[PDB]
Structure formats: C-alpha cells, structure tokens
Chain A
Amino acid sequence: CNGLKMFLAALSLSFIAKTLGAIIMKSSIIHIERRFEISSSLVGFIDGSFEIGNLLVIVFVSYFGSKLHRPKLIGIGCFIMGIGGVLTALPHFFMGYYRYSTLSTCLISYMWIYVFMGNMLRGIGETPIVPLGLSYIDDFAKEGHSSLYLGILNAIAMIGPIIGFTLGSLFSKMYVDIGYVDLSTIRITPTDSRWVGAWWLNFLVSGLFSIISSIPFFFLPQTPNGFFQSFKSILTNPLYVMFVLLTLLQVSSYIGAFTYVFKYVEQQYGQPSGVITIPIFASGMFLGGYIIKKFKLNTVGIAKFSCFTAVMSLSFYLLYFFILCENKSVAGLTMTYDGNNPVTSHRDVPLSYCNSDCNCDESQWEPVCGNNGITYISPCLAGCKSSFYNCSCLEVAHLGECPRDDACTRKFYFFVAIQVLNLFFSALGGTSHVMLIVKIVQPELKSLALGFHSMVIRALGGILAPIYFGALIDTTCIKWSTNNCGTRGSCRTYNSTSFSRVYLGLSSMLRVSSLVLYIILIYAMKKKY
C-alpha cells in the first residue's frame, strides 16, 4: 500500500456503507410505516427525502470540494450519513412500548420527522463519495489504472446489498421490543399483519458502519505524492451535454425496466416475484474495467466499447417480442363469464346466466382455478356453492390462479437467460460512463462534471423514469381495485400482450434513441480528435 491503495480501500468501504444504507432504508420501510402509523403519502415523502437532500447539495459539494481536502470531505460525508443512521433509529429509543391491539360462495404521530431529517442527512452523506472520490482516484492514479480501480469499487460495492438483505431478514424476525419485554408474552408472529420487526437495529448497524468507514479518511494525505463560469464551461461543451442526455436515456431505460421486471414476469409467465445475479454483475463490472485497462483504450476507444456493449444489450433485448406467451383466459375479463363468447372490451361486461342470483361483490378479487384451465374472478362469480364444489359456471375449482403451460415456462427460462446475459452486458459498460465523462471535460472540472451528471441521472432517470414507466404500464390494466377511501388504488390483472408491448417497446425505443446518440457522439469525437 503506497498511499492511493489505502484511499481505494477506504472508498471501497464507503461504497459498501452507502449501498448497505440504501438497501436498509428500502427494506425497513414497511416496519417503519407500521410502527409510526403513517400513511402512504407521508412514507413516500420520507423515502423522497433522500433525493431532496442529495440533489440540492450534490452540485455545490462536487464543485467546491474539488479544491479542498477531498478525503477529509468524504470522511465528513460518511460521518454525516452515520449520524443520520443513528438519528433514524433514535425514535425507537424514547417512544415507549409498541402496542398492536370470506368463503365467497354462490348464494341462492410526529416522530417520523426524526426519520425524515435523518434520511435527509443520509442524502447529504452519500453526496461527496462519487464526484470527489472518483476525481481523487483518476487524478492521482497511473495512466489507465483508474478504470480497473472503479471496476473493483463497483464489484466490492455489491457486498453492501448482501449484508443489507441478510441483516434485514435477520432483524425482521426479531421483535421490535427485543431486550425490553419478556418474549414469551409476545403472541404475534412475523406472518401477522401487525408485526413490527427491529427496524431500529438496521439503522444502528448502518449508522455505526458509516461511522467506522468515516475513520480512515482523516488519516489520508491531500496528495499521495468561479462556480458560474465553470458551470457554463461544463454546459456549453457539446460532447458533455450529448453524453449526459445519452446516459440519461440509457439509465432511464435501465431503471424503468428493473423497477417492473418482476411485475412483468408475474403477469406474462405467471411466476411469483440476486442469488446468481450479483456475482455475474460483479464479474461484468470488473471485466469491463479490466478490458478498458488491458486493451489501453483512448476516449474514442472507451466510447466504442460502451457503444458496442449497449448495441449487444439491445440486440439481446429485442428477442423479448418473440417469446411472448399467450394471454390468460380469465372469465369476465377477456371473455364472458360462461366462457362461450369473447367480449368487446373489459369495461362493464354483462353477467351470465350461470350466476344470475349473484349475492357477491364484483370488486372483490379472489382468483380461483377451474378444471378447464380457465381462471375465474371470484368463487362467488364462479357459481361454486360449497367449499370448491358444485360450480355452475364451469359447465360448458381450486383456490389461486391457474398455473400456465410448460410451453411458455420454457419461454420463461429463455427470458431469465436473456436477463442474465443482458445484465452482464449492461454491467460490462458501467465504468465507461465515468471514464468518458472524465476524459471529455477539462481536468479541473472532473468533479463537477461527475456531480451534475449524478444530479441528472438520479433526478430525471431515477425519479421520473419509474413514474412514467408506471404511467404507461397502468393504462393496460384490466381489473382495477377500489380502495377503502375510494382513491387511486392498485391493479390486479393486465392485458398481457398490451402490457408487454408497452413495456418492451418503451424500453426498446428508449434504447434506440441512445444508440442514435452513440452514433452521433462517435462521429463527433472522431471529427474532434
């Protein structure tokens, strides 16, 4: 270890800490919503507090910290996210004890602020890690060694989610009042709807891990051996602006896909919603950095390598239109209730003569699977009178939806193979964004160019892309569920070809536009260099 390797190890530990904190905040939020008795809008506000804290300071921290003691500011940020992790768990310590307390047959209050600001403090915590850290790495490393270091950092950052889901599953089974009550008196199970796990333990572990990872930065040297004018010079660079729009489109497609991969798998292939995926992603990230380092690519070479990986990723993505299994046959949604005549649409379908009594509820969704392979909406709509036996509408029934044929279970196995290959190719070009966006801009603007881009990716691709992906997804919903308060609820079944066409088409053209921007940017750097 000759100075820079110590910084590389400490920044690796900070990468583990920040990804661990993200996974912990995502996983413990159900227990937080149950314990603090807060609504969905408030808990969404607490979730978005990290974005609110991060985005408003990332550009200014990246600009002003590039001239200061960069490892000292990274250690200050790790200390800050540690204090936020402790402050998130501090509501538990001084609130007191937690207190908690249809066959359908055919008939013939202010404590969340300590979470909120704490999560907001975590938003200020992760802020100096990517721009100042990566500028410190690639300013002082050997010529070509920085891509290998970033690939190693992104590979070892995957230890963080492993610890996160492991400790979340470990501390969810524990009661929230562990160490305070006699556990024999606790009657409820983790399967109970009133169960609250030890969510505070997650934040205490993450906070003290961030405080431990803050320690080695204060022992590192500064060197191993205007805002508006600089922001104008950044935003008038055409290569930079085209690269930021390009990677915004690509990462927007990534996030909008990965948010609803499991919903698409559930609706298209019928399977229920990272055991092998995480080593594949880590090996792909390290191998992409190693390819960049060993082949000694220049700026144009790194651009062609990233372009080729994303061309190959879309080339594998375009097979998704050919492995589409057939639509579900659900009585009363795609056909009539008797299954003899297809319907014109799914909006207010008429009832059939097999269940003309109908002392049921059409809004209630309890799917049942018949012997003919046709799922029904409810057993009460299915004509079943005893429990299910003597079902009237089966005449030309187990609980749950019908499992589909093995013919598209084979297509599902093809689909998860193409997902594995696609995630390998997408992780193969992860380093190239930072390498290109360093080499494009001026050398004293490396951090700010890494800051503002990190603002554009997390805002317009991190926040907005799941919103508009979900907006285009929800227009394919067939059976809508009415909420208890009558507000915007959730969807239960989707028109599978329509939902698939919208999802894969939106991802596909959002990748095609990025490929066009690749070709223009390759021509632009070939003309300029």
Chain B
Amino acid sequence: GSSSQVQLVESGGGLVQAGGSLRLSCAASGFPVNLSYMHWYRQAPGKEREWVAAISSWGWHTEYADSVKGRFTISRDNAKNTVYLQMNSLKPEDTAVYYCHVRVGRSYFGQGTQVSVSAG
C-alpha cells in the first residue's frame, strides 16, 4: 500500500425543497478503507459536529443517529470504494454541512458540502 493518507471527497450536495430527497457520496483515496467503518457527520450553523450515520467494513451492521432514524439510508460500495447517504423526507432542521469520516490509522475528515434545505 504505497500511499500517504486517506483523502475523502464528498459530492451530491445541493439545494432541496420541502420533504424531498438527496444522495451524498463520499469517495476515498489513499490507504484502503476496506477494513474500516466510515461515518457521516453534520455541522449545524452555530453547533458542533452532530453524528448522523455509520457503516461497517462490509456493510453488515449500520449505526444510525436518533435524530434521523428510518428517513436516512447509509450504504457502501467497496468495489468503487465509496459510501452513500440517501436522505428522504427532509426537514429544515437537517440543513447542515455533511462531512465524511474514516479512521484508517488516523482520524480523517472530509471537506463537507452544503446540503441547504429550503422550508415550505
């Protein structure tokens, strides 16, 4: 594994209106994240890093927050080395910057994309 560190890139952030849907993808480059749990965090305006979701190494066991339970859907695809977060029936309280997190050796965070949600 001739690599330096794991860089996580997010995509799929964008404006949504009412109880809509979205899908955030996190791609990993560097050390293999195939053994490691990859998590989804959020940052509310004026609040710290709330924990949203988690996935296992092979997608066998998923941990979800009690803030969004049954509305969100985390998923993993290890062939393309990506995790996804499907979000359905959104609320304006979900308006946050969503980060992707892995801990292959060292704790590694994403840049975060605006998932601003309109109210209506």
Binding site for B on A (CB under 8 A): 93-97, 99, 109-110, 180
Closest to A185 in B: B48
B15 lies within 8 A of chain A by Cβ: no
A180 to B109: give the CA distance in the assembly, Å. Answer: 12
Q: Is the CB of B61 within 8 A of A96?
A: no
Instruction: Determine if A180 and B107 form an interchain contact, defined as CB atoms under 8 angstroms apart.
Output: yes
Among A93, A95, A99, A180, contact of B51 (Cβ-Cβ < 8 Å): A99
| Residues of B74-110 whose CB lies within 8 A of A | 101, 103-105, 107
Chain A nearest CB from B56 CB (Å) reads: 6
**B54 in contact (CB, < 8 A):** yes
Contact check, B56 vs A96: say whether CB atoms are below 8 A apart.
Answer: no
Confirm or deny: B35 has a beta carbon within 8 angstroms of a beta carbon on chain A: yes
Question: What's the nearest-Cβ distance from chain A to residue B108, in Å?
Answer: 10
Q: How far is the CA of A511 from the CA of B56 in the complex (A)?
A: 52
Measured CB to CB, the nearest residue on chain A to B105 is: A93
Interface centre among B39, B51, B103, B105, by most A CB within 10 Å? B103
CA distance A93 to B37 in the complex (A): 10
Contacts of B104 in A (CB 8 A): 94
Contact B60 A96 (CB under 8 A): no
How many Å from the CB of B57 to the closest CB on chain A? 8
Chain B: interface residue total (CB-CB under 8 A): 14
* Nearest residue, chain A, Cβ from B54: A96
Can you list 19 contacts pairing A with B, beta carbon distance less than 8 Å?
A: A93-B103, A94-B35, A94-B36, A94-B103, A94-B104, A95-B103, A96-B36, A96-B37, A96-B39, A96-B101, A96-B103, A97-B39, A97-B51, A109-B56, A109-B60, A110-B56, A110-B60, A110-B61, A180-B107
Please indicate the chain A residues that have their CB under 8 angstroms from the CB of B37 in the complex: 94-96
Note all chain A residues with C-beta closer than 8 A to B107: 96-97, 180
Contacts of B39 in A (CB 8 A): 96-97
Counting chain B CB atoms within 10 Å of each CB, the highest count among A93, A94, A95, A110 belongs to: A94
Q: Which residues of B contact A109 (CB under 8 A)?
A: 56, 60-61
Contacts of A99 in B (CB 8 A): 51
Q: Which 3 A-B pairs have the closest CB atoms?
A: A94-B36, A109-B61, A96-B37
Within residues 34 to 68 of chain B, which ones have a CB less than 8 A from any CB in chain A? 35-37, 39, 51, 54, 56, 60-61
Distance between A115 CB and nearest chain B CB, rounded to angstroms: 15
Distance to closest chain B CB from A196 (angstroms) = 16
Q: Given A110-B56, A180-B107, decide whether A95 and B61 contact each other with a Cβ distance below 8 A.
A: no
Complex: A93 Cα to B54 Cα, angstroms: 16
Q: How far is the CA of A99 from the CA of B65 in the complex (A)?
A: 11
User: In the complex, which residue of chain A has the Cβ closest to the Cβ of B58?
Assistant: A110
How far is B107's CA from A180's CA once the two chains are assembled, in angstroms?
7
> In the bound complex, how far is the Cα of B107 from the Cα of A96, in angstroms?
7
CB distance from A182 to the nearest CB of B (A): 11
In addition to A94-B36, A109-B60, 15 A-B residue pairs with Cβ atoms within 8 Å of each other are A93-B103, A93-B105, A94-B37, A95-B36, A95-B37, A95-B103, A96-B37, A97-B39, A97-B103, A97-B107, A99-B51, A109-B56, A110-B56, A110-B60, A180-B107
Rounded to whole Å, the gap between the CB of B116 and the closest CB of chain A is 26
Residues of A within 8 A of B56 (CB): 109-110
- Give the Cβ gap from B105 to chain A, nearest Cβ, in Å: 6
Distance of A203 from chain B, by nearest CB (Å) = 16
Which residues of A are found within 8 Å of B54, using beta-carbon distances? Answer: 96
Within the assembled complex, what's the spacing in Å between the Cα atoms of A410 and B54? Answer: 58
Q: Distance (Å) between the CB of A275 and the closest chain B CB?
A: 40
Report the nearest B residue to A181, measured CB to CB. Answer: B107
How far apart sit A93 and B39, CA to CA, in the bound complex (Å)? 14
**In the assembly, what is the distance between CA of A109 and CA of B61, in Å?**
6
Considering the chains assembled together, what is the distance between the CA atoms of A99 and B39 in angstroms? 12
Contacts of A94 in B (CB 8 A): 35-37, 103-105
Most chain A CB inside 10 Å of its own CB: which residue of B51, B104, B107? B107
| Complex Cα–Cα for A110 and B36 (A) | 12
Nearest opposing residue in chain A for B39, CB measure:
A96
> B45 to chain A: closest CB distance in Å?
20
- B105 contact set on A, CB distance < 8 A: 93-94
Q: Which residues of A contact B103 (CB under 8 A)?
A: 93-97
CB-CB nearest in chain B for A93 = B105
Residues of chain A with a CB closer than 8 A to B61's CB = 109-110
Q: Within 8 Å CB of A110, what residues of B?
A: 56, 60-61
**Taking the nearest CB of chain B, how far is it from the CB of A181, in angstroms?**
9
- Hey, which chain B residues are within 8 Å of A180, CB to CB? 107
A388 to chain B, nearest CB (A): 39
In the assembled complex, the CB of A513 is this many whole angstroms from the nearest CB of chain B, namely: 50
A95 to B63, CA, bound (A): 12
